[PDB]
Design an enzyme around this catalytic site. Structure first.
Site: not given
Ligand SMILES: CNc1ccc2c(n1)sc1c(N3CCN([C@@H]4O[C@H](C(=O)O)[C@@H](O)[C@H](O)[C@H]4O)CC3)nc(NC)nc12
Ligand SMILES: CNc1ccc2c(n1)sc1c(N3CCN([C@@H]4O[C@H](C(=O)O)[C@@H](O)[C@H](O)[C@H]4O)CC3)nc(NC)nc12
Lengths: 493, 493, 493, 493
Positions: D136, D309-310, D364, D366, D401
């Site tokens: 990202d 990372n991730e 990380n 959210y 994060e």
């Molecule tokens: C609980 N329900 C769900 C469902 C779907 C997803 C998640 N949770 S979480 C996630 C994800 N993330 C990818 C990015 N990662 C970090 O987030 C930053 C940002 O998003 O701002 C990034 O800038 C930074 O570089 C990254 O380290 C955080 C996870 N990608 C995708 N692709 C469709 N789907 C999901």
């Protein structure tokens, strides 16, 4: 005599109907002006996202509700006088009886729940205890519209007078691939609108209505569509006075259970028009059609009817659902005005039941945003490919929605999505393809102005696809359309 | 029966009174909703900045103007029924006579010219053929308010009932350096407000009024001032219901000809209260005082009167101008509520005629903006020096205005003027000095929200000193005040 | 070998030269990258607005300062090697001597004080212990530029090569009312620029320089002016490579003591060129002219010299001040390139000493902003009246500055000052009058991008007159100019 | 001697290696400053989104590339001297041989293609002929970093000196659930950062680095993480001087093929560590680990290593992929510093291979955005439930994060997603749960500032999760963290 003012107000808890609040005056009550959507008039998520009933009340002394969203329950001294299902069209009751002496107690209970039985329909999750709309606008509710006691040409209006009722003389009918008003080939210029202002929500806003019309005449526009619900009576008469072409639309948005997403019954997804588990809105859909046409029968600005917005029109059961509603529309329109429905992305000329039932093809296409963005070249190939195929029907094609979310202020010389530059480029590509086909008879951008939606990752504080902000300030795209529409006439384009 | 709706509308050219437009229906007419200020409801500078008369008209069938800004001239079939000078207070006429049959023609002519005879007064140039306001808000005009035919505690309201009129019981009087409501030491928390929304201009906005009150209760505020004119009756009753302390103020802003600038007669600048060339507003000033107090006699929220906003109170003739108006204010207030006037920058305790006439000292100070900015340290020295001197009077001192223009969105970790950080620092310094003196009894920020002004180099698309934007969205300073006001009680601070 | 990096850094207190900090390594020191203006690289008003000296230091092991703003004092092991007055042009010293062994201590002391002896000149108060600039940009200081150890056509560049030095062949000279490059009638398209980025301040920014050039070629521009100081050598060579016409300008801004405001000596205002109390910059003004021309002698992009920006050119003593500097400019330019000066508002063809000395008339006019705004019609009458009178000289007239402050994001369909719409209308009116006169040979907007200034009520977080924001994002006006300049050729307009 | 400057530049077409451009000087060439990412330095989508090779070239006269993103191919007179795979770590070549006479031709060819063999890895579609990043942030490429020829305490740095190399003395090791620097219980305060500025892209920005450090010290932060790649050497030494704790991270982002989305081979989705069709990055992953640790062996600011990372750490093959890389990290770190990896959402303590290999658990999460938003109450239940379970390991847990996209300027008193109020509420809820568990040893917000990403519906002109804008201006959340972090010490929290 207008009852508009600040009334007593309280939310149900939900031990309200038990304690018979409609009999006694409300204790521990709040204040609320009518007409207005109540959702944005107090603070806190629990108030804005309230699920259930609210209780309006106001004294009387010595009744037509212009709209109550969605379900109304009128009282007087405790005795129920009315019930109404339908949040965007008027209803009235007789009050010679039940009106005692002088000091009496008028209570209006309003419900906001939406499901498969309502128009608009509420899903079970997010489209893109709580209401989850199957539509892309916020579920504003309350007494939205006032409660009271008791040749025409586009952009060149003339209304004779005739109770006194104003009327304008004009002919409208479809010939081949031509939309003719007074036997001249018209071109729709405008947008899909919303009854959306701050903080009124969906509440009627006569100042903003006039300002909207002034902005449209400033932008050299001629039409808009009452997406996705019939507007106020006052707004309709204004378009009669101001000579603004309108496409009247019912409250039939969200009869399409393929958003998002979908709904499952027995480990399997159900179709939209499943008779057992799908939509239960048909008999209410025609009730809205016969109530709408009974209201705007004589508005010379009303030019075409829209039975539903973005339905599952290419699915099993779609034809048998819309045929009796379509026929009704032609049955009760004494002018035999054209009827249509606006089609979702993914619809083709072969699979859309609108290909046969509708006099005009009304498309909602997002080539360059939802499809293809940010590749405007690839998206152009697709738009031309689908548009060529729509010409096989020899009918007028009309784009009722096309746009790209744009947050006012974001810019780049090398544009990216969500900037003002990308929005202009998006419309340039689309409009270029529209000008290639003589059977398209109008462009209506989405949206006229930014409007509030339910919260989701895909909605940046509402829908930002407006040419103008929610406070009607223009984005760069608004000056692009003004220049383009200045060279496109109303007739003969 | 409310006459509110979209009326016929036309601007004079100015061959209007010759051709007797008030007799026949207006040809080539426009549309205009009432109640609303017309200035922002059409496009073009020549319409917004129109100088002269406008003609409203509406049919009738079988009269109290809540406000007509500024000068009203009512007609019926041609025969003049009324005249009224005063753009922010109600007036009515009898209509048993002059009302023929059914279909009749009601015409309202409205003038916008302001000069040395009007309240507010219009100067000859910009303050910071055309009207040049001697005040810092836009000259919105038209039928601003509707035309119709026919113990209490702060933040803890209780109104008995008593024609039916609601009433709230409360005692208010001044003792020494204490402002007491119900014999408890009150502290004013709030702002100076404006009747300003988009696009209504100054037109009444019942939705925004309730939203404003909700925001104030969200921010832990208790008071505001009707700067710089009496508000609508509906807004006053709402503060009665919601328990919001109000400082009622007359239309007497701009009786100070030292802005900008100044006016010269014979090669020499003239003083404000020059009897021959200065202000000619005295007898109208008391007409407004006796009309105001007659309207809000019984509003328990009305707590103190404000005779004028920012007058030339330290000039020759200032005392003899305000003495008969001050006495009148105490003469007709059956509650003997405190009376005051809000003082311009540059006023000292010795030179202000308010030092003797007023029960409460109400200051409008801009230490850290107009004076000293961006030097917040130097501006702190000055604010303390003037505030100490104001304590010599043994009266309550109250800041009714203090603020810094802030465009929402501008930020810096090392703040500069016009950013959101500088605005918070400005208020931190001021509030720190306010907390040092036990004789200050309130803080009221300027402004509550951004509002439209006349155009000038010093006004960035209006006045940006609001804690909130014009669409009521909070700037960072709005959350600062919410935290500070949460720890400051209504009584005993 | 480039010495660019993060050095040791400390501010004087001001007991710095006493304690001989240039001898020993700095204790309690901070960090600072060079080349860069230090003002924005730490937090706090006391650091950004620091008055006095700063101390850079860096070790060496085994010298040309491209610019040190304003006054440099170079050391080595304690022994002073250099002094330089002049903050925007290079200087060097010999180091074979004084360079001991290996591990040595290079200290650079930088002063920021500006007064009547400096170029740019510092006044005694705000133009619109502290420096008060007599110019409208921020007093960025420090080691702005690096410290190191050691046919051509517009928009169609071709440079032969020739130590190796690139060179481009082109002829430039004035005939009548025509500016000819290679004997073809040129038209200037572009702006007045600033070396201003975040957070570098005035520090050299090679990335932004290339991005600026790309944006200009995107906008169909051909020229700019080094307002108000000579730029970096690297930026000049880039315009040689990219074929961008440049107007080289000295550091002579603010030789005009009529801003704001003014300065008094014995109860009376003093003129600009008062020999006793006025400007003391003459002999330094020619030192800058002979240092500038010695640097850019061979840049084919340098097309015309600018002796000063906005001087008191219509005042007593103005002619005798600029005559010896003008003559010097023609004396040392081996190409005999045109020389000029850009004139303040209020200058007329009769009173401007530039009417005789300059080959090209370069105006800075603000009809529609500082003069007349918001009355664009009245401002048009004035611009035409002054422009007609400038044609009496039979010389080329060129607008080097015209603009209106515009905060990105502010919009209205009925424009007001500070919105993006008003900025476009402002430029439309001006450009319309420019196209009426065949003796105008160029338009250069002010500014290219928003830039930081000193704080004042009239500056909304800097100067907002840029077509682009400070991060180079376009305002609506940037797309207006791009469309206009696309139809205006480089030659033959 | 630094070679940094504006070089010759051209994009391949792709008949470049055939015509042997590295031999002859480039015809029809452009200009490009180094060090800088080239993507944003010209206009047009085809330039910014260019797929393939670019050709830098610069003359020489009488070599260490600090970083070339991603693949470098160095030439001289035509003869290839070097190749390097790895876009964020230095490499050098010997030049005594191959350097003829004086005037020679140095060409650097740079490739931007990313796939399953690169670190970072490029997918086949959008994560949320073209490169489609599995990460990202935007795929900035070119010569990002310069080409040249040749007790310590947090927030209280002291570096002795020792070629001369600075060094700082400090002990770091993990005991139980405690992260100890110099045997004191540390708490991480800070963010995940990005090398992202305008217009440099990922190019080194020494001014912004110092401004970033000043802002962190203004905000009372102590740490950050080099997400998602090792930063410049100059930035690392600055944290040594300024006493900023750093978590060094490799270029191993996107080794997780469950985004979006996924990739299919034979009608079936493939796992991440499929040996035949999955990632082919292992042997390059350790090459980066041994190259990184060889560079920052002695930086006292480097406190912990981050292997990836991730990654798909809870999938088959995850353990056997990271075990040899983890062991290597402890093998070559002479200080035996802690090693970890930052885990995607959906990871639990039982399924994460980091539960055993890592000394510190770095999450990380959210809760309140990607999961649960806008329901902050429900999201709080989940965050506590997962955080309690992570305590079962008796290890230090650290959030690297957590954030919510926030467009600067959007506000509401009743917050919704994307406004500044919602961002503060999001962090309030999260921080409240963090303070409930004594085994969390740090909070690092995502992101420090807004940064550019690839275009998608879910990215509003880049990633807006920064506490600051891309030009480092603070959002409201930046002042929230500053207040919270002011009461949280570095040790003993
Ligand atoms: C609980 N329900 C769900 C469902 C779907 C997803 C998640 N949770 S979480 C996630 C994800 N993330 C990818 C990015 N990662 C970090 O987030 C930053 C940002 O998003 O701002 C990034 O800038 C930074 O570089 C990254 O380290 C955080 C996870 N990608 C995708 N692709 C469709 N789907 C999901
Ligand atoms: C006709 N009526 C009046 C009355 C007063 C003034 C004017 N006209 S004009 C002017 C002025 N200017 C100074 C700046 N100069 C250029 O303007 C740019 C900008 O202002 O944006 C600057 O950034 C740029 O550096 C300058 O070269 C333009 C003249 N200064 C002051 N001081 C009180 N008063 C006036």
């Amino acid at each position: 005599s207008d009852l508009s003012g600040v009334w007593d107000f309280k939310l149900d808890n939900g031990k309200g109907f038990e304690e018979k609040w409609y009999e006694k005056p409300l204790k521990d009550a709040d204040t609320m002006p009518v007409p207005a959507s109540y959702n944005d008039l107090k603070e806190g998520t629990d108030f804005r996202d309230h699920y259930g009933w609210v209780f309006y009340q106001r004294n009387i002394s010595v009744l037509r509700c212009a709209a109550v969203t969605h379900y109304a329950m009128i009282y007087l001294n405790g005795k129920l006088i009315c019930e109404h299902k339908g949040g965007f069209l008027p209803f009235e009751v007789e009050l010679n009886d039940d009106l005692q002496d002088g000091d009496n107690l008028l209570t209006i209970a309003v419900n906001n729940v939406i499901d498969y039985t309502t128009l608009p329909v509420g899903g079970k999750a997010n489209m893109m205890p709580q209401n989850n709309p199957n539509f892309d606008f916020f579920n504003y509710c309350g007494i939205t519209r006032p409660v009271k006691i008791y040749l025409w040409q586009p952009l060149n209006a003339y209304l004779y007078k005739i109770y006194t009722l104003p009327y304008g003389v004009r002919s409208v009918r479809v010939d081949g691939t031509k939309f003719l008003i007074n036997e001249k080939p018209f071109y729709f210029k405008g947008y899909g609108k919303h009854e959306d202002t701050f903080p009124n929500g969906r509440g009627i806003n006569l100042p903003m209505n006039t300002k909207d019309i002034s902005i449209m005449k400033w932008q050299h526009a001629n039409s808009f569509r009452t997406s996705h619900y019939p507007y106020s009576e006052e707004m309709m008469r204004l378009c009669d006075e101001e000579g603004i072409v309108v496409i009247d639309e019912t409250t039939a948005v969200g009869v399409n259970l393929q958003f998002g997403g979908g709904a499952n019954f027995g480990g399997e997804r159900i179709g939209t028009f499943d008779k057992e588990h799908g939509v239960q809105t048909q008999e209410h859909h025609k009730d809205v059609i016969r109530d709408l046409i009974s209201r705007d029968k004589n508005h010379a600005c009303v030019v075409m009817w829209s039975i539903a917005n973005e339905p599952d029109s290419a699915a099993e059961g779609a034809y048998d659902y819309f045929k009796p509603l379509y026929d009704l529309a032609r049955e009760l329109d004494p002018q035999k005005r054209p009827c249509t429905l606006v089609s979702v992305q993914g619809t083709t000329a072969d699979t859309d039941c609108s290909s046969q039932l509708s006099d005009v093809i009304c498309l909602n296409r997002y080539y360059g945003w939802y499809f293809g963005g940010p590749d405007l070249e690839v998206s152009e190939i697709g738009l031309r490919k689908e548009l060529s195929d729509w010409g096989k029907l020899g009918k007028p094609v009309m784009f009722t929605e096309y746009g790209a979310d744009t947050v006012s202020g974001l810019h780049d010389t090398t544009s990216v999505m969500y900037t003002e530059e990308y929005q202009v480029e998006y419309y340039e590509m689309n409009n270029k393809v529209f000008d290639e086909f003589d059977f398209v008879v109008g462009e209506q951008a989405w949206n006229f102005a930014d409007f509030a939606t339910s919260q989701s990752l895909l909605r940046v504080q509402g829908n930002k696809k407006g040419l103008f902000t929610r406070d009607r300030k223009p984005k760069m795209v608004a000056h692009y359309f003004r220049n383009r529409w200045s060279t496109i006439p109303e007739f003969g384009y």
